[PDB]
């Protein structure tokens, strides 16, 4: 990067949805300023988003699906194989929810 | 308001600050808009609040 | 949205004018909306969120 | 002089001339103005395109400048 | 499709946050941001060729010092005219 400073305006030169996701890096760099790191690192993440997530198209929902997804992901991120009760105690959810999150982790490929 | 005595010049009257912003509030909004410290009118309302 | 006009028009009302496309006009509206969500023009608009 | 510290980018020179000087890695206008004509002709391919452009900018090769480069 | 896609997006985002030094658990609101100004349908986000070509040419002329045109052509698979365009472009910036 480095020259990204000069690239500030050429980043959106003859651009496309990159400029849309440039808005993303704005938000990202805003949160980066919130995070404490230098905001000018944001482009790296977005270009990574282009390389490992780009190439296709995705549909995005609007409602409770993402709420269930975030609850289950925060449940399953701390799972180690013998801490189901730990997840239930920490996240204030019954064994059913943590077991459903574990099944979500198992059924994916 | 209530009246009180003053050292003032013959053409000067002591106006308290609290009522000054209340009376000239539209003028404050306009001056703040022209000065560029307030993006919108309601932002100026919040600032004077 | 019928701004500056006596009435608004639905998807089918605007289709007969330019093009009868259904999802294309919807994604045009979505693209315009997401363009209006850019923090380069929406800084003033965000202040109007409280009202 | 406000031109000595400026890089060689402010010459608008020809592609052949803009390529030849990169072989010697000239980065300052003062660096090239210190170099005289008797040693810049050894590089291949220029001899008819430097004097006019330097005179248009009020400069000439072979001049002696001290404390160069000043950094 | 959408749940698995969102899960992949979130885990990859948090992994990159860890790679960048930030806390991975801050990925979620980012995708929530992805929601708030992009939710509603399906969009195509394939390449974004502008920035990719720009970083490509940036690396190309970073490799260039004075005379590596042949090696640039051999490695990056672009002819000398593209190298000239890149050098002129980097001359444009001061």
From Swiss-Prot, chain A:
Induction: This protein is constitively expressed from the Pgem promoter unlike most other early proteins which are expressed under the control of the Pe promoter. Its expression seems to escape repression by repressor protein c and thus could occur throughout latency. The keyword Transcription applies. Changing residue 55 to A/H/L/P/R: Complete loss of DNA-binding and transcription activation ability. One of its GO terms (cellular component) is host cell cytoplasm. Residues 17-53 are annotated as: Dimerization. Residues 83-103 bind DNA. Keywords: Activator, DNA-binding, Early protein, Host cytoplasm, Transcription, Transcription regulation. Changing residue 63 to R: Complete loss of DNA-binding and transcription activation ability. One of its GO terms (molecular function) is DNA binding. It comes from the Viruses. It is found in: Host cytoplasm. Changing residue 54 to M/N/R/T/V: Complete loss of DNA-binding and transcription activation ability. Residues 66-109 are annotated as: DNA-binding. Homodimer. Belongs to the c/mor transcriptional regulatory family. Activator of the Pm promoter, which controls middle genes expression. Activation of Pm allows expression of protein C necessary for late gene expression. In addition to Mor binding, activation of Pm might require the interaction of Mor with the C-terminus of host RNAP subunits RpoA and RpoH. This is Middle operon regulator. It comes from Escherichia phage Mu. The lineage of its organism: Viruses, Duplodnaviria, Heunggongvirae, Uroviricota, Caudoviricetes. The chain holds residues 12 to 120 of 129 of the full protein.
From Swiss-Prot, chain B:
Acetylated on several lysine residues in the presence of glucose. Co-administration of salinamide and rifampicin or salinamide and myxopyronin suppresses the emergence of resistance to both antibiotics. Signal peptide: none annotated. The RNAP catalytic core consists of 2 alpha, 1 beta, 1 beta' and 1 omega subunit. When a sigma factor is associated with the core the holoenzyme is formed, which can initiate transcription. The rRNA transcription and antitermination complex (rrnTAC) consists of RNAP, NusA, NusB, NusE (rpsJ), NusG, SubB, ribosomal protein S4, DNA and precursor rRNA; S4 is more flexible than other subunits. DNA-dependent RNA polymerase (RNAP) catalyzes the transcription of DNA into RNA using the four ribonucleoside triphosphates as substrates. Resistance to the antibiotics salinamide A, salinamide B, rifampicin, streptolydigin, CBR703, myxopyronin, and lipiarmycin can result from mutations in this protein. Belongs to the RNA polymerase beta' chain family. This is DNA-directed RNA polymerase subunit beta'. The gene is rpoC.
Swiss-Prot record, chain C:
It is found in: Cytoplasm. Residues 11-30 bind DNA. It comes from the Bacteria. Residues 22-37 are annotated as: Interaction with anti-sigma factors. Residues 1-38 are annotated as: Sigma-70 factor domain-4. Interacts transiently with the RNA polymerase catalytic core formed by RpoA, RpoB, RpoC and RpoZ (2 alpha, 1 beta, 1 beta' and 1 omega subunit) to form the RNA polymerase holoenzyme that can initiate transcription. Identified in a complex containing RpoD, the RNA polymerase subunits RpoA, RpoB and RpoZ, CRP and DNA. Interacts with Rsd; this prevents interaction with the RNA polymerase catalytic core and with promoter DNA, and as a consequence, promotes transcription from promoters that require alternative sigma factors. (Microbial infection) Interacts with Escherichia phage lambda antitermination protein Q. Belongs to the sigma-70 factor family. RpoD/SigA subfamily. Sigma factors are initiation factors that promote the attachment of RNA polymerase to specific initiation sites and are then released. This sigma factor is the primary sigma factor during exponential growth. Preferentially transcribes genes associated with fast growth, such as ribosomal operons, other protein-synthesis related genes, rRNA- and tRNA-encoding genes and prfB. This is RNA polymerase sigma factor RpoD. It comes from Escherichia coli (strain K12). The lineage of its organism: Bacteria, Pseudomonadati, Pseudomonadota, Gammaproteobacteria, Enterobacterales.
Curated annotation (Swiss-Prot), chain D:
(Microbial infection) ADP-ribosylated on both alpha subunits by the phage T4 protein ModA. ADP-ribosylated on only one of the alpha subunits by the phage T4 protein Alt. The N-terminal domain is essential for RNAP assembly and basal transcription, whereas the C-terminal domain is involved in interaction with transcriptional regulators (such as CRP) and with upstream promoter elements. The modification ADP-ribosylarginine is found at residue 16. Residues 1-71 are annotated as: Alpha C-terminal domain (alpha-CTD). This is DNA-directed RNA polymerase subunit alpha. The chain holds residues 250 to 324 of 329 of the full protein. Homodimer. The RNAP catalytic core consists of 2 alpha, 1 beta, 1 beta' and 1 omega subunit. When a sigma factor is associated with the core the holoenzyme is formed, which can initiate transcription. Both the N- and C-terminus interact with different regions of transcriptional regulator CRP. The rRNA transcription and antitermination complex (rrnTAC) consists of RNAP, NusA, NusB, NusE (rpsJ), NusG, SubB, ribosomal protein S4, DNA and precursor rRNA; S4 is more flexible than other subunits. Belongs to the RNA polymerase alpha chain family. It comes from Escherichia coli (strain K12).
